[PDB]
Amino acid sequence: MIPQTLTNTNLFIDGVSFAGDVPSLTLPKLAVKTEQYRAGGMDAPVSIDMGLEAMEAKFSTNGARREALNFFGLADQSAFNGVFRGSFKGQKGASVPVVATLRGLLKEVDPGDWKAGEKAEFKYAVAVSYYKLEVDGREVYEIDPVNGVRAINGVDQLAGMRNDL
Amino acid sequence: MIPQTLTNTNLFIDGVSFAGDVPSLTLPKLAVKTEQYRAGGMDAPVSIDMGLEAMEAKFSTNGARREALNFFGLADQSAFNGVFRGSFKGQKGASVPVVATLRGLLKEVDPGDWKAGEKAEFKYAVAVSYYKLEVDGREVYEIDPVNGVRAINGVDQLAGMRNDL
Amino acid sequence: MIGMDRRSGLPLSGLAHLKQSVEDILTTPLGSRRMRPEYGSKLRRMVDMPVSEGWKSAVQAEVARSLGRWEPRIGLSAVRVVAVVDGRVDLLLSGVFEG
Amino acid sequence: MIGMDRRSGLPLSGLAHLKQSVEDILTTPLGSRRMRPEYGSKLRRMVDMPVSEGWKSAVQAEVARSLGRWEPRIGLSAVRVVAVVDGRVDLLLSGVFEG
Amino acid sequence: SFFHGVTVTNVDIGARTIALPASSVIGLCDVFTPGAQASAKPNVPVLLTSKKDAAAAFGIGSSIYLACEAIYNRAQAVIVAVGVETAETPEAQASAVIGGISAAGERTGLQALLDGKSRFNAQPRLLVAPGHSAQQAVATAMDGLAEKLRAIAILDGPNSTDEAAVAYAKNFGSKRLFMVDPGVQVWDSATNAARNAPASAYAAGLFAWTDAEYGFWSSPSNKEIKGVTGTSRPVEFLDGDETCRANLLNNANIATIIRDDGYRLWGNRTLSSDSKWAFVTRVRTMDLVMDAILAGHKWAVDRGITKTYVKDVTEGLRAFMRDLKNQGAVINFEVYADPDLNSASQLAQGKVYWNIRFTDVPPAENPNFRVEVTDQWLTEVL
Amino acid sequence: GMGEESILLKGAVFPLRRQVGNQEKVVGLEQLEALRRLAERREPLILS
Amino acid sequence: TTCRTADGDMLDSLCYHVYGHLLGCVEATLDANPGLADEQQPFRAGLLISFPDMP
């Protein structure tokens, strides 16, 4: 495999582009909720696939963007959508578009230390209520919390748990 | 969008200007109080808009300002008002006045380590009882804790919660 | 239950009697009836008070008391201000039917 | 228990009577029987409703009620959609045998 | 002259033309008497919400109000009601209902229901002519107006026997027609006897009750009719594919009021020649997602074609249709921009294509039950 | 004998989260009082 | 408590909707109704039953 890595990024909020604004991203930490199963006879505790943790997507902005500050604390969830994009270049120039369409609720706004000479930062946080990662053009993750569809590589893994029982 | 960022700042306390005094600000961290809702059938816990956290606005001062030290621990709340101002310049010189009119209670005064050669700092903290952020001239946030008006982009979001029920 | 109409004396029973049963509660002040002092509403005390958002919740809390006493066949749902002209506020008295 | 068949009048006892005992539950609506109003199924109310994933769990929860009343010798296991043609959904009524 | 005390008011106060559920608006055309008690000109549309609006705009004894009461007894519906002046010749009475451009610049009759939008924000989804649909000339008029309107026309057969209505359904097959032949009768206060209602407006109030309380994707057959008594024909019904007068009408693509003489409608297939478009829920979910796609995405006719614009709405629709998928309105779909037909030769012309492919939920009109018993894996008795 | 067998259902109702697929309708305040009305019937219940 | 039928309303269903049970509730309805049982049991649309109290 050729070495690839992130070179540039982008961010959309409800259609408009933050094409000169965002210095930082954080896609939500996908983590399975593990319960330690050690029992009679078995030596080491195994960890069991028993649901996902709380997804939360940080992003950051250096200027007062009215488009980003508009979506804090709205009475309807999933009014914020947001689209996070990356571009992974490879060794031979074959750039790979990593796009992550989330549809969460905007959770936290903290304009931090407004020192005079130092640039200011508006850290954001998004209580993610929908997540969908695409590596090149193909859909890798599709996380419905509120629905019963956890699609890994396009096939629902929660549907396979119901057929086993 | 053109790149903008903070270049200079200012601070008012009850009308008078701290035009040569404050090295630091902190607007209050707007954060929604989230309760993890995972239930029967659903996989990942969603976070629900269920009120805001405690707003608190730090600011800092290098000299003994009698106008700032006057408002500590007064018997009436919202006797302290305070106005925090910023200026975000853009790439083409279009400076954007970010003004945040808060009306909290002054909460904490700690003159820190008075070393001899090192400059001294008077950190302040404001228990915010009213918050109002304006990005350019338009009112983005208007947070009434004690009243039922949480205005995001000029429209009350708490009023929309009462019409839904 | 079959009662008679207030005006014109006609015996009307089903649901026109239901509406005039409510409007005998809302427009009688307390103590105006003979030998029945705990009858009526405090809505005449709410007449010509400023329409705040606490005046609305004090009318909902007082219509629910006065209909809870002498109108058991009505479950009150909500009372809403729907218009304001000079002095004349008007309230959509909505409630489900029981009994 | 020995009963007679619905059509052709023949007395059949063991397990063909078991299957027609279930299909008298599932296809009679409620209140259609004489002097037995709490008999039958709400499956006729589920006729010509869209096949969602909540329609499936409402049929499992209603076959289990109606067989729990008047069919104690059948323990219901599952109800599954196995095919869909235009309108005609078809359900594999699977259940263990008791009694 | 004001008043200073507590007062009761029995007249309407507030406006309810704000909500306007776009899937349940009804076009209505029948006769009335334009007197001084009916404050509406004949060949103009007028917006209706409650029975007080039908009482103010039309006469009580007029058969507009008899059709408005037939809808408003069941659902909180919105009606675009056009009137026609009653004629003498019934072949010329049908000429008044079809209307046309017989005026200078005014549409009359059924054609004024096309002017529902640009008057009252109601693009009508249910076409009913109560009584004036046993004639073929108006049922063909309601046919051809339906695909202009993207609605379905609820016509009705004659109140004669079954083969008089089966052969009346063989003149169609045009995907937009929903016929309910037994004209059901309703109790009257003044007559103190049994009336004769055409039972095409009762199916319109049942569709407005279905798409607002159960969703438009749900099949509006097995649901209750209010304001009803027995039918004009006792229509029997059994289970097991008999010679019933229920299975005879349903196999002829005709719906009918069936159980307990007035209790429920029964039947969902439309007058269509194609088996693909046999159900009304195939037809209703075809048009009520693709005008709900547009509602909210009304910005797609401006904001000219830049690089992000083709990409802006291709997950603008994907994020809206997954909201339709999660509430059950469809099952799994795909939304993608058209690769081959999109070209720069017609992108400067303004044309740019998107491909929508969704399958919808089937209505369970015939649930089968293969009962099987066992103990662990097999039939232990036999 | 057999003794008391009991089932205890925990949980939480959030009556502002909108119904699934954004059906223009929220989870109601009525929707736990429906459990109360169904419990004053003095009547057993089938769990399914 | 006089009720009016439809053309398919039936007696044991009606006094189950009114009373809540059918033990001693149909013949008490047929007792205080002149000529009700003479009429055919799939009822016509306009016949009136006065349901008595204490069935």
Method by which this entry was solved? cryo-EM
Helix H or strand E encompassing A110: strand A105-111
DSSP string for B141-164: EEE-SSSS-EEETTEEHHHHHHH-
Mark E228-266 as b/e (b = at least 16 C-beta within 10 Å): bbbbbbebeeeeeeeebbbbbbbebbbbbbbbbbbbbbb
Exposed, middle or buried by CB within 10 Å (0-12, 13-18, 19+), for E210?
buried
At residue E146's C-alpha, the angle toward residues E145 and E152, to 5°, is 150
Contact list in F for residue D68 (CB cut-off 8 A) is 46
- Give, as one character, the DSSP assignment of residue F33: H
3-state secondary structure E61-114: CCHHHHHHHHHHCCCCCEEEEEEEECCCCHHHHHHHHHCECCCCCCCEHHHHHH
- Give, as one character, the DSSP assignment of residue E213: I
Contact list in E for residue A81 (CB cut-off 8 A) is 319
CA distance E73 to chain C (A): 16
Query: Which tokens go with E246?
Result: 């229920």
Of residues E73, E74, E91, the one with CA closest to residue E132: E91
Contact between residue B4 and residue A77 where contact means Cβ atoms under 8 Å apart: no
Q: Is A11 in a helix, a strand, or coil?
A: strand
Query: Which tokens go with E291?
Result: 């005008």
CA distance B165 to chain F (A): 7
CA distance A15 to chain E (A): 6
At residue E250's C-alpha, the angle toward residues E245 and E252, to 5°, is 100
In total, the C-beta contacts within 8 angstroms joining chain D to chain E are 106
Contact list in D for residue E363 (CB cut-off 8 A) is 48-51, 87
3-state secondary structure B55-113: CEEEEEECCCCHHHHCCECCCCCCCCCCEEEEEECCCCCCCEEEEEECCCEEEEEEECC
> D55 — contact with chain E (CB < 8 Å)?
yes
Q: Given an 8 Å threshold on Cβ–Cβ distance, is B161 in contact with A108?
A: no
Distance of CA A157 to the CA centre of its chain: 19
Q: Given an 8 Å threshold on Cβ–Cβ distance, is C26 in contact with E13?
A: no
Chain B neighbours, 3+ Cβ pairs < 8 A: A, F
> F28 — contact with chain B (CB < 8 Å)?
yes
- F14, F26, F28 ranked by CB distance to B37: nearest: F14
CA distance F21 to chain E (A): 4
CA distance B118 to chain F (A): 54
Stated in angstroms to one decimal place, the resolution of this structure is 3.5
Length of chain G, in residues: 55
First-residue to last-residue Cα distance in chain F: 25
Q: Are strands E265-266 and E256-257 parallel, antiparallel or unpaired?
A: antiparallel
Contact between residue E230 and residue E184 where contact means Cβ atoms under 8 Å apart: yes
C-alpha A91/C-alpha E162 separation (Å) is 77
Q: Given an 8 Å threshold on Cβ–Cβ distance, is E362 in contact with D55?
A: no
Spell out the residues 6+ positions from residue C38 whose beta carbon is closer than 8 angstroms to its own: C30, C69
* Residue A52 CA: distances (Å) to CA of B34, B42, F18: 17, 10, 22
C-alpha B142/C-alpha B50 separation (Å) is 17
Contact list in C for residue E2 (CB cut-off 8 A) is 86-88
Domain ranges for chain E: 13-273, 274-362
E124 phi/psi in degrees, rounded to 5: -65, 135
| Nearest C-alpha in E relative to C44 | E6
> B164 — contact with chain F (CB < 8 Å)?
yes
Instruction: Rounding to the nearest 10 degrees, give the CA dihedral for residues B144, B145, B151, B157.
Output: -150
Query: Which tokens go with E377?
Result: 């894996």
Query: Which tokens go with E242?
Result: 């008999």
Q: Are strands E265-266 and E126-128 parallel, antiparallel or unpaired?
A: unpaired
- A70, A75, A145 ranked by CB distance to B161: nearest: A75
C-alpha E264/C-alpha E221 separation (Å) is 8
Judged by phi (left if over 0) then psi (alpha if -120 to 50, else beta), residue E114 lies in alpha
For residue E85, what are the β-bridge partners? E32
Chain E interface disruption, residue of F17, F18, F22, F27, most E CBs within 10 A: F22
Of residues E357, E355, E359, E316, the one with CA closest to residue E336: E355
Of residues C34, F14, E232, the one with CA closest to residue B51: F14
Helix H or strand E encompassing E323: helix E316-326
Q: Is E235 in a helix, a strand, or coil?
A: coil
Spell out the residues 6+ positions from residue E13 whose beta carbon is closer than 8 angstroms to its own: C82, C83, C90, C92
**E residues 51..110 contacting D (CB < 8 A):** none
C-alpha C92/C-alpha E22 separation (Å) is 26
Q: Given an 8 Å threshold on Cβ–Cβ distance, is F12 in contact with B37?
A: yes
> D72 — contact with chain G (CB < 8 Å)?
no
C-alpha A105/C-alpha A124 separation (Å) is 11
Contact between residue A50 and residue A111 where contact means Cβ atoms under 8 Å apart: no
Q: Given an 8 Å threshold on Cβ–Cβ distance, is E326 in contact with F20?
A: yes
* Residue E152 CA: distances (Å) to CA of E23, E25, E285: 11, 11, 12
Of residues E247, E243, E249, the one with CA closest to residue E163: E249
DSSP string for E260-311: TTTTBEE--B-SBS-STT-BHHHHHHHHTTTTTTTTT-GGGGSS---HHHHH
Q: Are strands D11-12 and D74-84 parallel, antiparallel or unpaired?
A: unpaired
C-alpha D86/C-alpha E364 separation (Å) is 9
Contact between residue B18 and residue B10 where contact means Cβ atoms under 8 Å apart: yes
Chain C neighbours, 3+ Cβ pairs < 8 A: E
C-alpha B46/C-alpha A128 separation (Å) is 7
E163 phi/psi in degrees, rounded to 5: -70, -15
Q: Given an 8 Å threshold on Cβ–Cβ distance, is B39 in contact with F15?
A: no
Query: Which tokens go with A147?
Result: 């629905």
C-alpha A149/C-alpha D72 separation (Å) is 37
For residue E30, what are the β-bridge partners? E83
Of residues A76, A90, A94, A98, the one with CA closest to residue A25: A98
Q: Given an 8 Å threshold on Cβ–Cβ distance, is C47 in contact with E9?
A: no
Whether F and A touch, i.e. at least 3 CB pairs below 8 A, reads as yes
Query: Which tokens go with B53?
Result: 């956290």
